[PDB]
Amino acid sequence: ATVLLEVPFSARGDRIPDAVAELRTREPIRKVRTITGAEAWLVSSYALCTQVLEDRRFSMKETAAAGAPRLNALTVPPEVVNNMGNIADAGLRKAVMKAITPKAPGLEQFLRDTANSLLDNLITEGAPADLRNDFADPLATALHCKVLGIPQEDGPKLFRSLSIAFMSSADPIPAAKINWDRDIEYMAGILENPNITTGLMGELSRLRKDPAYSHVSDELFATIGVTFFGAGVISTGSFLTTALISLIQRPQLRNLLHEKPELIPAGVEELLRINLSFADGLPRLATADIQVGDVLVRKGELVLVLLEGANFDPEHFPNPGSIELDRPNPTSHLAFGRGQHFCPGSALGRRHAQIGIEALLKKMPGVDLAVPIDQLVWRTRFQRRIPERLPVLW
């Protein structure tokens, strides 16, 4: 025999497997086995991905229930899976959303400054440079310290939790709990620290002492700090790293963007569309029996929404693998999800990538890989696809 098709198919974030277009054409929803042994439905067309993400009966929260078929082990307490629902129930959604927009005074200039400094330091040191460890990740870390209102010097230690926190493991991870409890203690300290008066933590700290929020738990306040730092940093650092690969490998596009930087937002949007940063489909648990294409998904089954399945669907995005700056539906991709759980940091993520790319093209217009592309080491069993190092010269 064969065996039931296993997911994920590949940890490489520089190319989509030809298999994905085959699945999408032949079986855009089909049964697969996850790393835990569970069965799941893998959905790989734009039409069916959108259907699942816009129907709340495919629940994010219920993926955390004891006994459910699992994509991977939880790395957070089960109540934290419903992190945005908990924020909304506490009456904090508007305030959190306001704090993480890129439009706060000085934020963009801070980003440009940070990027330019990181690049000057690479240039001083001489090629080769590692653009993930010494540019994309420290730019994301600095950004999220600023947005949180926490000291920049605390960013590296918070960051180092992330190579465990965002693992995609078959089994529970003891180091994840150790790092989680310590990071929650750090954020609780921030909330009690009178010097912290700006950003998302300064705003939470004020709301904590307002009568309108007196019955919101200290644990929820700390948890917002830890979760927004971690999701934001991993997601922006990983997206920028793999977007830089896709740009480096298209000298014609690199040169057009360098020359006409007003096209950078359109090119970022295409880079988001083609991005293979999410290593796994987005999980949902069916709360009812729901027809999805030719399959009747049954109550209690796991569904996995394959982002690249949707974003490379030629029925929605003709010539899907090409970066085309003049598409008529450019923001209609699923790179930030869709529906109830649409990314709350989408603007912030776009801006981080736009600024980092602008700054890199101006400082290193001759940027190129310093190693053959096949020599990049792809991180395995993780919730993002990322090269461990990204060696470049210029």
Ligand X SMILES: Nc1n[nH]cc1-c1ccc(O)cc1
**Which residues sit at the interface with ligand X, rule CB under 6 A?**
75-76, 80, 83, 165, 226-227, 230-231
Please return the burial class of 181, using the count of CB atoms within 10 Å of its CB with bins 0-12, 13-18 and 19+: exposed
Of these partners, ligand X, ligand HEM, none, which one is at the site of residue 335 (CB under 5 to 8 Å by kind)?
ligand HEM
Instruction: Tell me which of 69, 149, 281, 345 binds ligand HEM, using CB under 6 A.
Output: 345
Tokens 């991977």 found at: 72
Least distance to ligand HEM from the beta carbon of 84, Å?
3
CB–CB of 46/308 below 8 Å?
no
Report, in Å, the least distance between residue 353 CB and ligand HEM: 6
What does residue 258 show for φ and ψ, rounded to 5 degrees? -60, -45
Q: Does residue 196 touch ligand HEM according to CB under 6 A?
A: no
Strand 129-130 to 39-43 pairing: unpaired
Give the phi and the psi of residue 49 in degrees, each rounded to 5.
-60, -50
Task: State the CB neighbour count (10 A cutoff) for residue 123.
Answer: 12
Residue 64: CB minimum distance to ligand X, A: 10
Within 199-218, the residues that bind ligand HEM by CB under 6 A are none
The closest alpha carbon to 239, from 343, 322, 102, 161, belongs to 343
The entry of ligand HEM, ligand X, none near residue 50 (CB within 5 to 8 angstroms by kind) is none
Q: Which long-range contacts (CB under 8 A, 24 or more apart) does 210-213 make?
A: 212/91, 213/90, 213/91, 213/92
Is residue 239 close enough to count as binding ligand HEM by CB under 6 A? Answer: yes
Residue 20 contacts ligand HEM per CB under 6 A: no
User: Binder to ligand HEM among 179, 235, 241, 242 (CB under 6 A)?
Assistant: 235
Q: Does residue 226 bind ligand HEM (CB under 6 A)? A: no
Instruction: Output the smallest distance, CB 153 to ligand X, in A.
Output: 20
239 binds, among ligand HEM, ligand X, none (CB under 5 to 8 A by kind): ligand HEM
Beta-sheet pairing, 391-393 with 129-130 = antiparallel
End-to-end CA distance of the chain: 51
- Number of residues in contact with ligand HEM under rule CB under 6 A: 22
**Over the range 33-60, which residues count as b (16 or more CB within 10 Å of their CB) and which as e?**
bbbbebebbbbbbbebbbbbbebeebbb
The single-letter DSSP state of residue 338 is -
60 lies in the binding site for ligand HEM (CB under 6 A) = yes
**In the complex, minimum distance from the CB of residue 158 to ligand HEM, in angstroms, rounded to a whole number:** 13
Site map 240..279 versus ligand HEM, x via CB under 6 A: -------------------------------------x--
C-alpha–C-alpha distance, residues 323 and 330, integer Å = 11
Close Cβ partners of 140 (under 8 Å, ≥ 6 residues apart) = 232, 233, 234, 236, 237, 240, 352
Work out what residue 337 binds among ligand X, ligand HEM, none; the CB cut-off runs from 5 to 8 Å by kind: ligand HEM
Q: Could you check whether the bond before residue 128 is cis, i.e. omega within 30 degrees of 0? A: yes
Task: Please pick, from the candidates 59, 236, 246, 311, the single residue that binds ligand HEM as defined by CB under 6 A.
Answer: 236
100 binds ligand HEM (CB under 6 A): yes
Is 341 among the residues that bind ligand HEM (CB under 6 A)?
A: yes
Nearest CB to ligand X, comparing residues 170 and 256: 170
H/E stretch holding 165 reads: helix 162-165
Q: Which two tokens stand for residue 211?
A: 């009568």
349 binds, among ligand HEM, ligand X, none (CB under 5 to 8 A by kind): ligand HEM
Q: Which does 309 bind (CB under 5 to 8 A by kind): ligand X, ligand HEM, none?
A: none
| By CB under 6 A, residue 281 contacts ligand HEM | no
Which of ligand X, ligand HEM, none interacts with 75 (beta carbon under 5 to 8 A by kind)? ligand X
Supply the minimum distance, in Å, between the C-beta of residue 87 and ligand X. Answer: 9
11: tokens are 């940890």
Chain contacts with ligand HEM (rule: CB under 6 A) = 60, 83-84, 100, 227-228, 231-232, 235-236, 239, 277, 282, 335-337, 341, 343-345, 348-349
